[PDB]
Every structure is written in C-alpha cells, then in structure tokens.
Amino acid sequence: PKKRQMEYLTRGLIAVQTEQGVFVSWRFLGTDHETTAFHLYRDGKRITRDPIAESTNFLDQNGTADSVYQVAAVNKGREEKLSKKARVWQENVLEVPLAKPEGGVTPDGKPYTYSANDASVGDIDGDGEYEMILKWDPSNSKDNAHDGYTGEVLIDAYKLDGTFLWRINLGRNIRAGAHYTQFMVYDLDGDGKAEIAMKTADGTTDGKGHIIGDEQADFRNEQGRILSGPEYLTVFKGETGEALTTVEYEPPRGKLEDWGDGYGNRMDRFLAGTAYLDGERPSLVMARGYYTRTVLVAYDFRNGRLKKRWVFDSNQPGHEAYAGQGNHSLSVADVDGDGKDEIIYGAMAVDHDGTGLYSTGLGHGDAMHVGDLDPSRKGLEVFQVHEDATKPYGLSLRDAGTGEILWGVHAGTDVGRGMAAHIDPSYKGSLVWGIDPPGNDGMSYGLFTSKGEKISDKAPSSANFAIWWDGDLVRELLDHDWDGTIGRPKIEKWDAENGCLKTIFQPAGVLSNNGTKGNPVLQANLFGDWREEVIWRTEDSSALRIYTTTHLTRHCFYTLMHDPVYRLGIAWQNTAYNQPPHTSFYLGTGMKKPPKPALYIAGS
C-alpha cells in the first residue's frame, strides 16, 4: 500500500486519579512496531517489570496525587527515550479556559451573546500535540430559510494548557449558521504544521488583524442574508491565524435562481473535507450545494498557494442524476481499493479524480456512516437515512464502492436520525437503526443487523454519535437529553439482553451544542489510548471540558488519529450537521487483526 502523510504525535501520556489508584494511558503510534511494548516509570523509577504489550493503559494502585509518570517504548529488548513527565489529573477532566467574546447588537437593535460551538484539531506548531480550533456561535445564528441578522463568526486557536493563540473574525459578510462556515484544519502542504481553510469575504480579519478586501463593504440585505459581493476562500497559518493565500470561492453564485430559489437557501449549503485524492498527500475539498446543483472543488496547497485540482459539477454532461443526493455531511474513504480517497457525498459518490463514482438516486439525508459495517462482506459499506418521503427508502445499506443497495427499508416519511455501530457483541459488525430526532413524533424505524435482519421494531433511542468510551470492543452511544431549550450531554450503553439504553456518563455543568442536534464541541481520540475523548462547553462557555476514560481495557489499537478514515472524520466533524467518525477497519467483537497504518510522518 501507498504510505500516507500523517501527523507526528508524542506518546500523549496522561494520568488520572481514580478511587482505585491512578489510571495511566498513552498512544500506540503508527510508527511503532506491532511487537513494541512499554515500560512505565513513576517518580523516575520503573514500576513495570515485564513490558506492557497487550494494551497502552495501566492502573497504578500505588499512584498518588503527587505522582509523575513517564513511558518508554521497548523494541527487541532495547528501551527507547522516556516520554515527557505527566502529572496526575484530579478528575477525568481537562479544563481549557476560553477567552469568551463579548456579545453585541445586530443592525436591528437585537442583542446576542456567544457560546462555544463546533471545534476541530490540528498541531499548529509541529510538537506532536493537538491545538483546539474553536468556532464561536452567536445566539442569533440562522437556518438558511429563516430571516434575520447574525452576529459575526469567530474562530479561535487554543493550546490544551489554556493558552489563547489567536482569533479570526469572519466579519459582517459571512452569515452565522450550521450551513455557512465549514472550517478545515489539516497540514495540507506537509510541513508538519496544520493550517485552516474556510470561506471568507470582504471584512474578514485574520489572526494578526489584517483585513481581507474592503473593510467598509456591507453586503447584508434587509433580511440579514448575504447574496451579493465577492466570495473568497482563504488558507490561514495555524500558528498565527494569518492569511497565507486568498482566492475566489468556487463555484460563484452566478444567477441566484439557477440554484433553485432566489433567496440562497439551496445555494448557501456548504460542506468541506480533506481527502487523499492521490493516496499519498491531502487535498482540500470545498463543496457547494446538495438539494439541486451540486459542486465539489478539489485543491492542493503547496508553497503558499492553492491550486485547483478538479471540479465535479452535477450540471456537467452525464452528472445530472448526482443532484439532490448530498447530505448535511460528507464522508471520505478509499472505497474501491485503489489506495486513493473517494468522497461519499451523502447518497452519491465522487471518484478520486473528480468523475462521478455513482449516484444511488435515494436522495438527501441527515445522517450517514461509512465504515466496515458488515465485516463478512469485502470492502466498506454505507448506512444512511433519507429525508424525501417520496423515495424508496427511509434507511439504506449499500456497498460503499459500487453503490449497490444491499437492502433498504421504506418509510414514506423523513427519517431524521440514523446510526451504525457495533452495539451487540452477538453480531459481528454494526447494528443499524433509524429514529425521529427530538421534538418530533418519537418514531422508531427499526433496529437491524448490517445484513438486514430485523432485531426489533423499537430501536435504541439514541442516534447521534457513537463513541468508544469504556474498555470493551462494543461502541457506546453519545447524545443528550433535550428539554426544548438546552441539552444535557450523556454517554449511554446498549443492553442487548433486555433492549434498553443505560446511562454510563453524564457530566454536570456542561451543555450540548446546536439545539436538538446535541453535538459535543468535539469527539476525538486526542490523547491517551485508543478510546475517544469528548469535549463539551461549560454552561457559560467560560471553558471547554475535555473528558477522558478511566475504564481499563485489555485491547490494543494504533491511535485512531493514525487511521486513514478516522483522522479524516475528525477533520469533517464540524461540517454542517456534525457526524461521528469511523475506523477504516472493523473494530468490534470477532474482529481480525487490523492492518498497521501505512504512513510517513510529515516534516520528517
């Protein structure tokens, strides 16, 4: 296999106080050998005798609040350089204080405030530790079709120690809302440091205070929309937030009505992804449209410049059937076995070279999941739900590479949420299900194996994120309890024996994001072992709280950020209606040994 550019990562050693001792976990790196084992040191002294070789975690019954840990890789009996010293966290929470921006007033005299919203991660300085890239959302942010002015969108960078690095202000000409700004954080050129790409406009102010274009320009109409004036695409330096290059946004508006309405409702439907279109280095993919005209534009970033790679446009001859298929998210994976990434754009797919891969014709939906959902069947599968009541299926399971529909279930109505996850150890692969979102009819559309066997008419009442949280191979479920105004985050576990969800984590003082959608700020394997961390905002957005597991595992996996599908999932997590990340391999009961990551480290 081709070796993919990936991020340098430190051991990511953490230590957390529990009632039974100090829980320690660290990364198994893509550069480690399958036979690599580990020694642990507490207060300078080795506390392991036999190197730890079956996991990258440890419960130290002799650890105290004052203990300091280091880990060393061991290969062929030879021990390597010890990690940085890790101190013991008092709780399984790392709190990152925020510089909460002050609210304001829109032109119509209506006040707004800010809350901490979607995030992404990138290593902006190349030291092997992630920084947080955080989007602030004003309290007046808008669904496209709802009129009204919005507060300016702000994007911040923070170090995990709470250091505020910079703020980008997108300015008055970028409307706030789920479907507008899609911020892509990645080391696009391979120097070892992440940059940030997003759509910008006249009046966007970068991290060093430099304004893009005309500072005086105001393209907001009486309804608070921006439907005129230049549109730009900017790559910002990770370290400083400074604009590196700005180009014209593609595709341009053209005649408004050609998108299907004159209000920009369909036109201003943006998505973004990072994809290894050559199977070796990342490319940037900025997308516009899914209900009607659908356009994906690929770029390569090198030596301070964006260069257009290709354009997929449903208006192109032979591509008409590709319109109306995109979801409020996209997925990225090598689905056809050529080593190169394809874009799974909801109910259709675009090949690595920008040609049409397939269109299912099943139409736009609000959730999708690409992974090895049926490990008995060669290749990846796509499970998704569908919104159009007139279409054949409310939920569909297909071959990811050919688009062949393996099975589907008719609904004759919008199926607004869906999940695919290994929640039942007695089925090798994912169960899949569809349910109504909160504040709707509370309907279930069934729980099925990925082969289409109906387990029950009543599906798990959570269909949002799935998260590896505890020690076992089953995936847990992340959602919230929505009360009509706010959501209280939770992680739940499926009880397959009696067909119910049990709450296993529900932290106080934090809120979910994006209304009924109930998103975390971010879910990602940020540090420690292969289990995933989760970030939620405090109620007042004075801080982010990053939660990490303290459940001991007997299982060992390479860090998920070194997985070619999972890492790209983190990059698109913020995109429109946030979707959860998946592994390129089947992780679950009865799994075969995963292949070691085929990679090289950017920046040597």
Q: List residues binding Ca ion (CB under 5 A).
A: 118, 123, 125, 127, 129, 187, 189, 191, 193, 334, 336, 338, 340, 351-352, 366, 372, 374, 377, 387, 470, 472, 474, 525, 528, 531, 574, 578
Distances (CA, A) of 551 to 18, 42, 355: 10, 20, 45
CB-wise, 250 or 472, nearer to Ca ion?
A: 472
Contacts of range 395-398, beta carbons closer than 8 Å, 24 or more positions apart: 395/432, 395/433, 395/434, 395/445, 395/446, 396/347, 396/360, 396/362, 397/373, 397/432, 397/448, 397/450, 397/452, 398/360
Does residue 414 have a known ligand-binding role?
no
CB-wise, 203 or 520, nearer to Ca ion?
A: 520
Does residue 424 have a known ligand-binding role?
no
Minimum gap (Å) between residue 233 Cβ and Ca ion: 17
Q: Give the CB-nearest residue to Ca ion.
A: 528
Does residue 108 have a known ligand-binding role?
no
Residues 1 and 17: their CA atoms lie apart, in Å, by 42
Minimum gap (Å) between residue 185 Cβ and Ca ion: 11
Q: Say how many residues make up the chain.
A: 604
Q: By C-alpha distance, which of 132, 176, 251 is closest to 546?
A: 132
Are 79 and 86 within 8 A, CB to CB?
no
CB-wise, 144 or 525, nearer to Ca ion?
A: 525
CB-wise, 300 or 472, nearer to Ca ion?
A: 472
Minimum gap (Å) between residue 68 Cβ and Ca ion: 20
CB-wise, 60 or 366, nearer to Ca ion?
A: 366
Does residue 220 have a known ligand-binding role?
yes
Are 43 and 13 within 8 A, CB to CB?
no
Does residue 143 have a known ligand-binding role?
no
Three-state SS at 429: coil
Q: By C-alpha distance, which of 23, 25, 39, 30 is closest to 71?
A: 39
Q: Which residues contact 562 (CB under 8 A, 6 or more apart)?
A: 6, 7, 9, 29, 30, 597, 599
Minimum gap (Å) between residue 43 Cβ and Ca ion: 24
Residues 125 and 297: their CA atoms lie apart, in Å, by 28
CA atoms within 13 A on the CB side of 26: 30
Does residue 366 have a known ligand-binding role?
yes
Minimum gap (Å) between residue 332 Cβ and Ca ion: 10
Does residue 152 have a known ligand-binding role?
yes
Are 6 and 30 within 8 A, CB to CB?
yes
CB-wise, 152 or 334, nearer to Ca ion?
A: 334
Minimum gap (Å) between residue 10 Cβ and Ca ion: 9
Minimum gap (Å) between residue 222 Cβ and Ca ion: 27
Minimum gap (Å) between residue 161 Cβ and Ca ion: 11
Residues 208 and 564: their CA atoms lie apart, in Å, by 33
Strand-pairing partners, residue 71, are 40
Residues 560 and 30: their CA atoms lie apart, in Å, by 9
Does residue 352 have a known ligand-binding role?
yes
Binding residues for Ca(2+), as ranges, are 118, 123, 125, 127, 129, 131, 187, 189, 191, 193, 195, 328, 334, 336, 338, 340, 342, 351-352, 364, 366, 372, 374, 377, 379, 381, 387, 470, 472, 474, 476, 525, 527, 529, 531, 533, 574, 576, 578
Binding residues are 117-118, 123, 125, 127, 129, 131, 137, 152, 172, 187, 189, 191, 193, 195, 203, 220, 328, 334, 336, 338, 340, 342, 351-352, 364, 366, 372, 374, 377, 379, 381, 387, 417, 470, 472, 474, 476, 514-516, 525, 527, 529, 531, 533, 574, 576-578
